């Protein structure tokens, strides 16, 4: 119920603009300083900007001062980040975060799940999903191969969220074609291969692509 | 609904001890630094002490360091001030106050109505209440004379709170007997003297004395 | 922190209340309004913001060695004491200014005078209190003189004065003449004579004991 | 702010994660836990306090030029990156440490090996992906070698490795052999050979194309 949700991520061309939105729920938004924090792939957290409750006092990381604008709409319970003149160094997951000092020091006490912005000249491309079908000790393995998409990320769930135990969704690898590829696998008892239905649910938000695929033994 | 309420005030002998309680309602008490602030009769606000949410970190005015102890019971939503070795300089209204920083600076965003502590060797003494009866242009005056009480304060309302317009409750004067005296008066239309009932409600909390008195024309 | 003891202003005009302290401009200043007998109330915080509920006529600034509370279009309801406040990180203490009483100027206004005999109730205790009431006048300066059988009294009365009324900016005053029941019954005519700038000549209210 | 890139600790023992910065002891330090692909989560704030929900095994201290996050009785669930954080009043910026990966030591554990043929679906596009899966092993170091009709493959595969599993502290690995449909149909036996410290001798999983 109390939560922050980022949208507006995906691919964007170098030198062009993108605007992120953060929608707050469950608390009184106008009472809080709000911030953007970013994390380049495989890197550390980096603070980006703060905005005061009333929207005018604002602080920026030096590297984005002049190109980024933080703003807010309290009536809409929403935080915005207007990003201009984007470059490869701006490629990152962007987190919406709430500012709070309880006893002594200012920190971030509420985070969104983040959205990945990829600065790239290349067009979005949704994935092809292929089954990794089980060979029919007590345990069988099966999965989905998510191939040739761009940019990151892809998410995979199994049976719409019901199946979580024994799931491994691997980090994407960058293929020689310049496109990403990822596998998600899951080990299940063999004695369910003929009984239980296994559907992988693939989501590639940058291309608005959603694919479900059911995986069987063949013959 | 959101409020702070001080109790435990009244007279106390020099060198002796008194403990004030503050009962918080309407908000999540354990989330806030809480404070005591005091005001000697006719003087300015004076900060006394802060206590951290978890009850251990505490700050004190120099003049009370060593004699006063601030403490709290979050389960009871209550703030305490243990006052020892009291002297005349400690005589004051003691306010319970909530600490808050919204945008930039720490301040007090919620206050109790305060309770008066009087450091004195003398015993409490409740008042006698006498009518100030109206003489029967379009307006008549009537009231109550609250005499010979100690220490301060007395409060007076009229018709249990219904009558507020045209009420004047004067500051007490210190009589040659060393006891206080106060009048509360109210101007009302003459044409109600035979109709409307006028009751003054006197409260002297230091002696747990409450008196109502109805005031009439005589003959 | 240093504040002028008082500021007075005509209705509709602008009150300026300063708060002095070395480099106070470098940190946040907040302002409380306190009506007599009431709890302090935030009217301006973080130099210049207003809590909801607080009229836009209240503004603040803060620079150098002086923060300023500004009250525009002053009305009777703004009569109160005002305190600035900072937090001092060098000694972990909250610090208040010495406070400023705002008085609203208004036109001269004559008192309504009333006199009240001691109650029968009080007499049975051997003491007579005679109360003279001056209701809703301006300015605050007033002269009350008691006369008993036309003898000017001295040394046996005390006065109390209200704070400025929050609606019409007037003052009220009570004067109490205290006598033993024995001295009270020794005389007949109890008079309260009021001199005041709203009165062209003194006003006397009196009673004859036993009526 | 400076943090060791990684700290490893045996289960039940104590992880110490330092955060270096000049006079950092003079202000408040906070610590975030970040699981892979998840949002940061406060585990210690204001030097040493814990949000509700957070186990008492997490404690913090802060003095001089070094703040320290301490995790006692470490368990698999504590695998994550940890970041310290302060606020810098001289440039109005939040400052993070460079982050520390905590790895939990466990016993050697052999992989379960599985091999998957390209789907019929993918073949109709002219490309064959052959996937070899190494499931739940330790340590992370593993050697996967592809053989096609017993010919050792080179330059035509890529590997991916999970982060440490949050329950059993193992890793998993996928190796993909990519061939054109034409080269794929030219050969019969597709084999994945796995060398690993949990295996006394190499383990081979294979299939014959067309089954």
């Amino acid at each position: 119920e109390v939560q922050l949700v980022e949208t507006g991520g995906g691919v964007v061309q170098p030198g062009r603009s993108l605007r992120l939105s953060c929608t707050a729920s469950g608390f009184t938004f106008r009472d809080y300083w709000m911030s953007w924090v970013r994390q380049a792939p495989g890197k550390g957290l980096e603070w980006v900007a703060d905005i005061h409750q009333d929207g005018q006092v604002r602080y920026y990381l030096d590297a984005v001062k002049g190109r980024f604008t933080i703003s807010r709409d309290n009536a809409k319970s929403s935080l915005y980040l207007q990003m201009n003149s984007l470059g490869a160094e701006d490629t990152a997951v962007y987190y919406c975060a709430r500012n709070f000092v309880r006893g002594f020091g200012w920190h971030f006490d509420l985070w969104g799940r983040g959205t990945l912005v990829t600065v790239s000249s290349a067009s979005t491309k949704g994935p092809s999903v292929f089954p990794l079908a089980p060979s029919s000790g007590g345990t069988a393995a099966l999965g989905c191969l998510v191939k040739d998409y761009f940019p990151e990320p892809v998410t995979v769930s199994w049976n719409s969220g019901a199946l979580t135990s024994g799931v491994h969704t691997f980090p994407a690898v960058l293929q020689s074609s310049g496109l990403y590829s990822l596998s998600s696998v899951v080990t299940v008892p063999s004695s369910s291969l003929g009984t239980q239905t296994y559907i992988c649910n693939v989501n590639h938000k940058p291309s608005n692509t959603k694919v479900d695929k059911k995986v069987e033994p063949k013959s | 609904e959101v409020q702070l309420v001080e109790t435990g005030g009244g007279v106390v002998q020099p060198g002796r001890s008194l403990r004030l309680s503050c009962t918080a309602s309407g908000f999540t008490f354990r989330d806030y630094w809480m404070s005591w602030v005091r005001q000697a009769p006719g003087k300015g606000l004076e900060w006394v002490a802060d206590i951290h949410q978890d009850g251990q970190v505490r700050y004190y005015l120099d003049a009370v360091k060593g004699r006063f102890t601030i403490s709290r019971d979050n389960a009871k939503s209550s703030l305490y001030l243990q006052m020892n070795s009291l002297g005349a300089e400690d005589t004051a209204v003691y306010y319970c106050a909530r600490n808050f920083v919204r945008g930039f600076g720490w301040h007090f965003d919620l206050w109790g109505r305060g309770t008066l502590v009087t450091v004195s060797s003398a015993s409490t003494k409740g008042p006698s209440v006498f009518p100030l009866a109206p003489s029967s242009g379009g307006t008549a005056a009537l009231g109550c004379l609250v005499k010979d009480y100690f220490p301060e304060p007395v409060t007076v309302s009229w018709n249990s709170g219904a009558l507020t317009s045209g009420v004047h409750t004067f500051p007490a004067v210190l009589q040659s007997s060393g006891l206080y005296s106060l009048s509360s008066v109210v101007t009302v239309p003459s044409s109600s003297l035979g109709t409307q009932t006028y009751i003054c409600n006197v409260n002297h909390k230091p002696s747990n004395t409450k008196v109502d008195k109805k005031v009439e024309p005589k003959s | 922190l240093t504040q002028p003891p008082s500021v007075s202003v005509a209705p509709g005009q602008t009150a300026r209340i300063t708060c002095g302290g070395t480099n106070i401009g470098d940190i946040s200043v907040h302002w409380y309004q306190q009506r007599p007998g009431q709890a302090p109330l935030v009217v301006v915080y973080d130099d210049s913001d207003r809590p909801s509920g607080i009229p836009e006529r209240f503004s603040g600034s803060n620079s150098g060695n002086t923060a300023t509370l500004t009250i525009s279009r002053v009305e009777a309801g703004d009569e109160a004491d005002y305190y600035c406040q900072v937090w001092d990180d060098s000694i972990n203490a909250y610090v208040f200014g010495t406070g400023t009483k705002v008085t609203v100027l208004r036109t001269v206004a004559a008192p309504s005078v009333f006199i009240f005999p001691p109650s029968d109730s009080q007499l049975k205790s051997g003491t007579a209190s005679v109360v003279c009431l001056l209701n809703n006048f301006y300015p605050r300066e007033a002269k009350v003189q008691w006369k008993v059988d036309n003898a000017l009294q001295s040394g046996n009365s005390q006065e109390s004065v209200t704070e400025q009324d929050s609606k019409d900016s007037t003052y009220s005053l009570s004067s109490t003449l205290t006598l033993s029941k024995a001295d009270y019954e020794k005389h007949k005519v109890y008079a309260c004579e009021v001199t005041h700038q709203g009165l062209s000549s003194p006003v006397t209210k009196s009673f004859n004991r036993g009526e | 702010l400076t943090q060791p890139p990684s700290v490893s600790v045996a289960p039940g023992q104590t992880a110490r994660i330092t955060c270096g910065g000049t006079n950092i002891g003079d202000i408040s330090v906070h610590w975030y836990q970040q699981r892979p692909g998840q949002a940061p989560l406060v585990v210690v704030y204001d030097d040493s306090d814990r949000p509700s929900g957070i186990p008492e095994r997490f404690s913090g201290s802060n003095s001089g030029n070094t703040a320290t996050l301490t995790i006692s009785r470490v368990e698999a669930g504590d695998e994550a990156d940890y970041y310290c954080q302060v606020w810098d009043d001289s440039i109005n910026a939040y400052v993070f440490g460079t982050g520390t990966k905590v790895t939990v030591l466990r016993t050697v554990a052999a992989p379960s090996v599985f091999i998957f043929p390209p789907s019929d679906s993918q073949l109709k596009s002219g490309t064959a992906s052959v996937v070899c899966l190494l499931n739940n092993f330790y340590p992370r170091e593993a050697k996967v070698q592809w053989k096609v009709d017993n010919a050792l493959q080179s330059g035509n595969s890529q590997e991916s490795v999970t982060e440490q599993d949050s329950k059993d502290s193992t890793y998993s690995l996928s190796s993909t052999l990519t061939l054109s449909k034409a080269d794929y149909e030219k050969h019969k036996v597709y084999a994945c050979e796995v060398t690993h410290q949990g295996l006394s001798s190499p383990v081979t999983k294979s299939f014959n194309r067309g089954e």
């Binding site: - | - | 070395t22 480099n23 470098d26 940190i27 946040s28 900072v86 001092d88 990180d89 | 001289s90």
Partner: peptide, 9 residues
């Protein structure tokens, strides 16, 4: 000043 910093010379 509208600032979160607390120092005052």
């Amino acid at each position: 000043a509208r600032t979160k910093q607390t120092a005052r010379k």
